[PDB]
Amino acid sequence: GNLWVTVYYGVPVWREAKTTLFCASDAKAYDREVHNVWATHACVPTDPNPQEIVLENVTENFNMWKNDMVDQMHEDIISLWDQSLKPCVKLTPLCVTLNCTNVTSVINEDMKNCSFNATTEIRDRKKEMYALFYKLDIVPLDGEKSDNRYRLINCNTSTITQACPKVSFDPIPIHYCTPAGFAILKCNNKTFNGTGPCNNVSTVQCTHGIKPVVSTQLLLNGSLAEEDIIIRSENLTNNAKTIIVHLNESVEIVCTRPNNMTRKSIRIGPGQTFYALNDIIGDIRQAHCNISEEKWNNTLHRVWKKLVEHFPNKTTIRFDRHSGGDLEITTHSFNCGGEFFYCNTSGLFNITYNSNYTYNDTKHNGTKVITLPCRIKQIINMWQEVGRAMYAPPIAGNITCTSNITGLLLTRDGGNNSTETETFRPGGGDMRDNWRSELYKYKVVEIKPLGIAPTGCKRRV
Amino acid sequence: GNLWVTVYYGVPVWREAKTTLFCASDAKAYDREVHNVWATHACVPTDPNPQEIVLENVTENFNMWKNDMVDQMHEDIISLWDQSLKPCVKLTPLCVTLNCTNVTSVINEDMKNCSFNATTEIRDRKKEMYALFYKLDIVPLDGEKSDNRYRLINCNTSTITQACPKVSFDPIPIHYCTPAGFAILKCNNKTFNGTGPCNNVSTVQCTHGIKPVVSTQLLLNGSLAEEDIIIRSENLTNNAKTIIVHLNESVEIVCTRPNNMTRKSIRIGPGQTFYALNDIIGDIRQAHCNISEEKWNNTLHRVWKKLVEHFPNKTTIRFDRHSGGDLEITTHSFNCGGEFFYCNTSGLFNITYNSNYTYNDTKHNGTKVITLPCRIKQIINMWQEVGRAMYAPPIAGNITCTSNITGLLLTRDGGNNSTETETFRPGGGDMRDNWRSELYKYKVVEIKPLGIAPTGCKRRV
Amino acid sequence: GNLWVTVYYGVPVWREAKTTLFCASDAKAYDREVHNVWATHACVPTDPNPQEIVLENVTENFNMWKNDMVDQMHEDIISLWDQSLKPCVKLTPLCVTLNCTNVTSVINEDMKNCSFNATTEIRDRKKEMYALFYKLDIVPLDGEKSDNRYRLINCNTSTITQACPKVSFDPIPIHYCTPAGFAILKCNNKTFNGTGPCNNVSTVQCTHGIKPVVSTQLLLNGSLAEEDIIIRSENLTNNAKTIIVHLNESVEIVCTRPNNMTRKSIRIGPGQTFYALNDIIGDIRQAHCNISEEKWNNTLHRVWKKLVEHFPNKTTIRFDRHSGGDLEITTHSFNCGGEFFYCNTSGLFNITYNSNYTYNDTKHNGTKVITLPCRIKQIINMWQEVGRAMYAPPIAGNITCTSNITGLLLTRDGGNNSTETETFRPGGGDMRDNWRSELYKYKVVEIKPLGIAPTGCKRRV
Amino acid sequence: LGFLGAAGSTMGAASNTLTVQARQLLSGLTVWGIKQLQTRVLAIERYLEVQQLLGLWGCSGKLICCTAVPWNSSWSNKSETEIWNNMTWMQWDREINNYTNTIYRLLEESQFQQEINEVDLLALD
Amino acid sequence: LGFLGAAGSTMGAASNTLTVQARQLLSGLTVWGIKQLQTRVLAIERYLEVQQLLGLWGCSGKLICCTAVPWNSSWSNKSETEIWNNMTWMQWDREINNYTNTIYRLLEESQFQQEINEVDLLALD
Amino acid sequence: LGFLGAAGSTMGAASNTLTVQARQLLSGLTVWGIKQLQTRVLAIERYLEVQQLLGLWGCSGKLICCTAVPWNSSWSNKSETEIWNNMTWMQWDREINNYTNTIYRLLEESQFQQEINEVDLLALD
Numbered sequence A, B, C: 001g002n003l004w005v006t007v008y009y010g011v012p013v014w015r016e017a018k019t020t021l022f023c024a025s026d027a028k029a030y031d032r033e034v035h036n037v038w039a040t041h042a043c044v045p046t047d048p049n050p051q052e053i054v055l056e057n058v059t060e061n062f063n064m065w066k067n068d069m070v071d072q073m074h075e076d077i078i079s080l081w082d083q084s085l086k087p088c089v090k091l092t093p094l095c096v097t098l099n100c101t102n103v104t105s106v107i108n109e110d111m112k113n114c115s116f117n118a119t120t121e122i123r124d125r126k127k128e129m130y131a132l133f134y135k136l137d138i139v140p141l142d143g144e145k146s147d148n149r150y151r152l153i154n155c156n157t158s159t160i161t162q163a164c165p166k167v168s169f170d171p172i173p174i175h176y177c178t179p180a181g182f183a184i185l186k187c188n189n190k191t192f193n194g195t196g197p198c199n200n201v202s203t204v205q206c207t208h209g210i211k212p213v214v215s216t217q218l219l220l221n222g223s224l225a226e227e228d229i230i231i232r233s234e235n236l237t238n239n240a241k242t243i244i245v246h247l248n249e250s251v252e253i254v255c256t257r258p259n260n261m262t263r264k265s266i267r268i269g270p271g272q273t274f275y276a277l278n279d280i281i282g283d284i285r286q287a288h289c290n291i292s293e294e295k296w297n298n299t300l301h302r303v304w305k306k307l308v309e310h311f312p313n314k315t316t317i318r319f320d321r322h323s324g325g326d327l328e329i330t331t332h333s334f335n336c337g338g339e340f341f342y343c344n345t346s347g348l349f350n351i352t353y354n355s356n357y358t359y360n361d362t363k364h365n366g367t368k369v370i371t372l373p374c375r376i377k378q379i380i381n382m383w384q385e386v387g388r389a390m391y392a393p394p395i396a397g398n399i400t401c402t403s404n405i406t407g408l409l410l411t412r413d414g415g416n417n418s419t420e421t422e423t424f425r426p427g428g429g430d431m432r433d434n435w436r437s438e439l440y441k442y443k444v445v446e447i448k449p450l451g452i453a454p455t456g457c458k459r460r461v
Numbered sequence D, E, F: 001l002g003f004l005g006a007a008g009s010t011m012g013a014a015s016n017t018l019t020v021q022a023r024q025l026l027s028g029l030t031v032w033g034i035k036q037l038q039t040r041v042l043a044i045e046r047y048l049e050v051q052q053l054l055g056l057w058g059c060s061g062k063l064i065c066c067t068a069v070p071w072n073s074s075w076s077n078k079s080e081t082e083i084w085n086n087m088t089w090m091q092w093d094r095e096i097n098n099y100t101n102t103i104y105r106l107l108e109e110s111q112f113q114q115e116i117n118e119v120d121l122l123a124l125d
């Protein structure tokens, strides 16, 4: 009948934790290929043959919107961006009066031929150089005369550090690993909607190598769903929360810049030189992206069906374009082949679906695509808290990329009463949501190996 | 009769130590209020309900003048000053010829209206801006003609980094905490004179939250004494040592700048802008401080009585002004509301006390105050080993502060033989003495838990 | 007959290791003498009365060419060089048109009197200053006219940071110490040729205080051999490997700059000033080094005998000058008294030795020396991966140093068939080889204290 | 099974694997080195904390260590079989979370009194 | 009492509180993190040093551990009662400061010989 | 002799000095502090790893600790005298390098089963 306190070490229990994690890049990423923004040599090598241990008979409560790993990843990406932009040449002497004129071929109407005086290797003589600059990067001086005098866009807000000539923007998988005394719980529930209980949860040491793809209104090169479309929102009845639609069938999107462009080195000062656009070889065609019409019809139909399931009694659901603002939020912004693309999405989100039409099966095949026009900037200022922008290096030859859209960053409109209509527009808010599309299953748990259990064993005197 | 060696762990003994300590700011200081010079986010949160454990039946030897915590605090303050002055805009382009004239109202005789050519957002055109600059910050060019051409004072010694537009100089308590294996001993003896034995010493984990107030000749917002005035000196018969008088009744001093001043942003270059004084609204009144005459009479009488006790056979004791030198040492230098004040103290330290007059009780009330004139600088260069000065930001509206003088940094004059007279002048030496006014009771002790004791217990084979 | 597993702690076994080591400067180097390039205050004090424990009855395999300590020392020297060149003034405004003319006395033919416009403390007026610049530091502008317009040599590749006015280049011993759980094995075999077995190996905590002397083609102030000349090469039949000849009798070399030179401060900008050469007092004599002819004859004869031993069937061995390239590799480059010297070595390596002459004993005494001419640069760019050069400070008075050559960095010529001739020229490759002349005996070993041994002792239940 | 593989298992089965969880408790430019360094010394601090707590109970160097402290029925009135047969470690952690500190103090005073009276008795002999 | 609360107390009373002093022995931008990190690993190093010294004496995991080393009268000719009744730990530290290293070596050779001859005797059985 | 002074000596003589090698296992601007800090916490990690491996075998706080695991003849068919008289520690490390992990697992399961059945038997009493 008598019982005594017994101590157990190695007890499998855990609580919540907010510990700092450490990165781990893949071993194949160490085959030289140096000087990429996301290539961090301080990351440890990825653990070979990694283990995921299935934990049966246990249920865990997850919450994507209260995860600290997303915030840690955002901060780590920001400081990596700062470290990569720190060393090379700044374009502060480039903030000078630019004599800009039209670009000789039809008019491009997207670039201007700007000549400027740049100091030579000696800072007492100045040579009149010239370069082709995008119209989104040059603001006209004054604003009341056609004097053809322009300047760089951020010559009055912060400083520009031009991207180093070797740098690359190719994403690589990053395996976030948790320290000793802590583990990562992954929810293997395929139906899981981002929060709540999970009856199939496994413990892992490191994540699945999340690619840090920077994109707005769309999710590029992300992990797909397993069963169906998974709609995730912190609070659906709140219109400020951004819905993260998770597709199960990724759609191929092919983007290109068919123009062939020349690169020329320009000396802006003693020991400071940067690469700039010189000439356009061949005909002039606008850069654009192609998305299959039938596949997008499939995606929009399935998304509307899931949104009808999540929003009862709404007769009509309209997919319209973005409301307004700067170009970085109103357009699909991404990076293809080292070049930053801003693509108009008015042709994609333009439909009205009602519950009284079957809408067929969106069959009858077809090779028709949606040619969404795109524009290119070089003065890139993302994550504006850093205080430092970029001058992206010019790329010779065409650029052509093929990516997969695996999710949409939808956002419901404001309160328009109970008129049985809700208009969902593309979002483009904080970039943290993008990482939240990947860390929707991972939580960090703090191991307590010390346990107390009554047993009829008594220690001797 | 036989005895054996016995080992004890957790033994309460200690020796001297020089270990590195770590800061701890208060939890209420983390309620945003970011971007203050002394607000260090790397400081850990202050431990709630902190304990001070009284150690009875023990006597410890303290020495304020050999403490390493004062040196550590001085170095930490210096590097915090460097880190706060590092990021924002430098005024190196502001080192240009200034066309200075009198300020329109009576003549202010303290500021000059200086116009200068500053580069716009493009570094090819220059606009003629103007600002009001204090005469202590502008040195005239050449020095043999009335050409009205001036320049900034340190355009030929080091660089100036203007204080960032949001920065604040409000001190916050800093709790210096000692690591594991070390403790802090505090001398609770109320009579304690700074060195020697202490029969009531308690062990603590962290200090009392010392405010890092920067001041010369006076001690602002410091801890008071308990019983009487405590005179502290490393060696009284040496005239080079600075006496740190510790008052028991702090005296209220109210300082103000009644002038209302306007702030205007001036662009000095591409991406570089600083705030400068523009205009004076209303009448012109000199900034000054008010100290009650009767309270200062009480303080000077008590200080003279204690100095008579510490210096026998001296018939006359004279309190005179400072000898000479730069303005940073000859005047009471402090910071009120983000503005640096340098106040003449000739009206305070001006008295001759002899032992043959009772000097009454300094009674008969009165509301008479001592109006000590003050001057304001903006090019602040304190702790000159850093190599970087400041341009303090202009403050709109009046500034009015009310502080307490709790101590005097007195300094005896040189050897004038045994003429039965010693003249004590205000000091203003190294700032470390100011921290030594607060760390006069704290010492760092190194715990040895391993102890040896004979006992008749023998370990079995 | 029964046996049981027994665990032993503190087992004296080790394997190979690549752990990071930590520096340790001497205690006498902490007697102020601050602001030297190799004086690192972060180095711990050198351990007093250091121990070297002789390990008998053991043989260890060493390899100088696969050691990681050499790479660690090279990286540490590079980052120390970066840290020392970081703080002080850059000469970017000095990249201006220079009006250069001949230096008044005979013509020096090594320096030019260059006048240039430098901005005063105000960046709106420019004064015409002048200085004496070495012809190796100024490249003429254009290159097709005698316009007497020159510029600094690296005004178009990188930036120059002039060496701080107090800095010194005097090497101090550096004791590389290994952490806990690791040891350093030193091969006491006096005959040891750099790789292979060693039958007398001792364990040590720290190295012998290696001086980081930077030199090409020669080894200055290095440790001597014990028995004879030791020729060390990774692969002798490969002509790309650099032979590190280790002398047993160091030869005294005295180098001097007999010219007396004046130093003048020149203001290049607001808060930026640098020291430059002004005038030459007295007669003009070319800087040169003196090496005793008989001692060099002894060294060359012994080196040829050892190279004959290592290269059989070769009738003739010729010592000729370097092939070609930049001045930093073609000449003996070193630093005497803070001044960088580049000395022509054509007079040293000029001999042909055959096996059919006895060559006497190179006796008959004599005081004849070899006067090898030398040139002096100030724009020093060594270890070009750093991206930052130096402007070495001018030194007033003559400079005279006396060093010891203790080794030669020989290099065999390319494949010229089996013609019974091999020509050995001075090298001057990567600087790591210089450190490999000192870390030829030290290896880092990783201690395993856990051992397993069978014993007939059984633990009780 | 592996690390945490008996978390959903019963108490008796989870007591049979304890070393693989004690393995993980130690395991083992200017900013990321700082972060890895800080989290490594943090994990080392937790391991030293747990080892010190084990040492203060007289259970150093052991995984399962008995203690002569009686089991108070106010902590749990459940008898042994439903604790050890149809219960997990997490549910027991949830029920006995409120009495953890009291149990810890009872263990430390028991061990300290055992050492003190062992010293007192062995000095008599 | 608390940490160091028996420093001025006698030896016998200060032996009764030892765990609260053993608690404190572990406890637990770019520059202040470095300083806190360095002082934490320094304290960890001292704790590991003291624990290793305890382990080499056969006293690991214990606060008061007896040892079969005889007490040399040359270290202290004082008998037990004035050591344990009217004496503090500091005054004993002051008197036996000169013989600390010799006592430490005697403990380590005693423990090492105990292990060696235990191995020698248990291999015979 | 000193640290590693019995590396070339025989097994029996090298077993007589073990504490001086266990001493060295702990020992004890912005970039060099980072390097020293990293290598110190690295050495601390190795010491904690070896101490944890000793603790999992029931050999914590001891230098030479016996174990009831039988010595398999497949690991080494050599009898005791040529192991302990004309052999060094390095040559034994070379011969028994292939069977290190298996021996480690046999020790850990032996210690774990000893703890488990000690708990089972002492609960009966």
Ligand SMILES: *[C@@H]1O[C@H](CO)[C@@H](O[C@@H]2O[C@H](CO)[C@@H](O[C@@H]3O[C@H](CO[C@H]4O[C@H](CO)[C@@H](O)[C@H](O)[C@@H]4O)[C@@H](O)[C@H](O[C@H]4O[C@H](CO)[C@@H](O)[C@H](O)[C@@H]4O[C@H]4O[C@H](CO)[C@@H](O)[C@H](O)[C@@H]4O)[C@@H]3O)[C@H](O)[C@H]2NC(C)=O)[C@H](O)[C@H]1NC(C)=O
Pocket: A033, A166, A168, A170, A171, A213, A220, A221, A334, A335, A336, A337, A338, A400, A401, A402, A403, A404
């Ligand atoms: C979502 O995921 C998709 C699928 O992975 C991805 O599309 C792919 O993007 C990559 C990265 O931009 C593209 O690869 C580039 O392709 C060309 C040429 O490479 C071709 O040929 C080589 C040779 O066999 C093949 O290995 C390769 O697969 C291609 O067929 C170049 O633009 C790129 O190479 C340069 O950049 C690399 C940086 O990662 C360097 O490592 C490499 O050495 C090259 O640099 C050198 O060459 C340049 C000129 O050639 C020169 O300017 C440089 O200075 C340097 O000398 C790169 O290999 C790949 O083709 C895409 N795949 C498809 C099907 O389109 C999406 O980008 C991704 N989306 C997002 C938003 O992340």
Ligand SMILES: *[C@@H]1O[C@H](CO)[C@@H](O[C@@H]2O[C@H](CO)[C@@H](O[C@@H]3O[C@H](CO[C@H]4O[C@H](CO)[C@@H](O)[C@H](O)[C@@H]4O)[C@@H](O)[C@H](O[C@H]4O[C@H](CO)[C@@H](O)[C@H](O)[C@@H]4O[C@H]4O[C@H](CO)[C@@H](O)[C@H](O)[C@@H]4O)[C@@H]3O)[C@H](O)[C@H]2NC(C)=O)[C@H](O)[C@H]1NC(C)=O
Pocket: B033, B166, B168, B170, B171, B213, B220, B221, B334, B335, B336, B337, B338, B400, B401, B402, B403, B404
């Ligand atoms: C010795 O100790 C004494 C006693 O504490 C101390 O005097 C006090 O100094 C403080 C700090 O300078 C003074 O507080 C300032 O007062 C005014 C206005 O504050 C009044 O109103 C608020 C609102 O209720 C009250 O909380 C407050 O008590 C006052 O009545 C302002 O100048 C200051 O506020 C600005 O500065 C803060 C920085 O600490 C910011 O946190 C705050 O948000 C304010 O900044 C904003 O407003 C500015 C314009 O208003 C604008 O320029 C900024 O950009 C920003 O938008 C501050 O609260 C206090 O009044 C003093 N007390 C007395 C009785 O005089 C001595 O200074 C001290 N001596 C030394 C040498 O350290």
Ligand SMILES: *[C@@H]1O[C@H](CO)[C@@H](O[C@@H]2O[C@H](CO)[C@@H](O[C@@H]3O[C@H](CO[C@H]4O[C@H](CO)[C@@H](O)[C@H](O)[C@@H]4O)[C@@H](O)[C@H](O[C@H]4O[C@H](CO)[C@@H](O)[C@H](O)[C@@H]4O[C@H]4O[C@H](CO)[C@@H](O)[C@H](O)[C@@H]4O)[C@@H]3O)[C@H](O)[C@H]2NC(C)=O)[C@H](O)[C@H]1NC(C)=O
Pocket: C033, C166, C168, C170, C171, C213, C220, C221, C334, C335, C336, C337, C338, C400, C401, C402, C403, C404
């Ligand atoms: C291989 O090893 C050899 C042998 O050690 C070495 O030669 C020696 O080099 C050192 C270092 O350059 C030479 O010492 C210099 O000598 C003169 C004057 O010093 C003489 O007088 C003092 C006073 O008694 C003696 O102690 C000394 O031995 C000499 O006789 C000066 O040029 C140097 O002093 C200045 O530099 C030091 C930096 O290390 C400072 O600490 C020192 O305070 C001095 O600086 C001050 O004075 C300068 C003007 O005097 C002024 O410009 C500075 O700003 C500052 O105010 C230094 O002591 C020594 O003479 C050499 N020995 C011989 C026999 O020639 C080789 O250099 C070495 N080779 C290599 C490649 O490393």
Ligand SMILES: *[C@@H]1O[C@H](CO)[C@@H](O[C@@H]2O[C@H](CO)[C@@H](O[C@@H]3O[C@H](CO)[C@@H](O)[C@H](O)[C@@H]3O)[C@H](O)[C@H]2NC(C)=O)[C@H](O)[C@H]1NC(C)=O
Pocket: C052, C053, C054, C188, C189, C200, C201, C202
């Ligand atoms: C094997 O290597 C060891 C370690 O280097 C050698 O021992 C060392 O021998 C030298 C002389 O060769 C000793 O230096 C001098 O020795 C004598 C006194 O012994 C005296 O002249 C000097 O006071 C000086 O000490 C040295 O002390 C000694 N030990 C060490 C640790 O360096 C040993 O000789 C080598 N054996 C060979 C080559 O056979």
Ligand SMILES: *[C@@H]1O[C@H](CO)[C@@H](O)[C@H](O)[C@H]1NC(C)=O
Pocket: B056, B057, E005, E006, E008, E009, E010
């Ligand atoms: C101090 O000594 C007195 C006797 O002189 C004793 O009563 C008291 O308890 C002691 N104080 C402490 C804290 O041990």
Ligand SMILES: *[C@@H]1O[C@H](CO)[C@@H](O)[C@H](O)[C@H]1NC(C)=O
Pocket: C056, C057, F005, F006, F008, F009, F010, F013
């Ligand atoms: C080396 O071996 C010899 C016998 O060959 C022995 O006498 C000597 O003591 C050994 N040395 C050491 C250090 O054990």
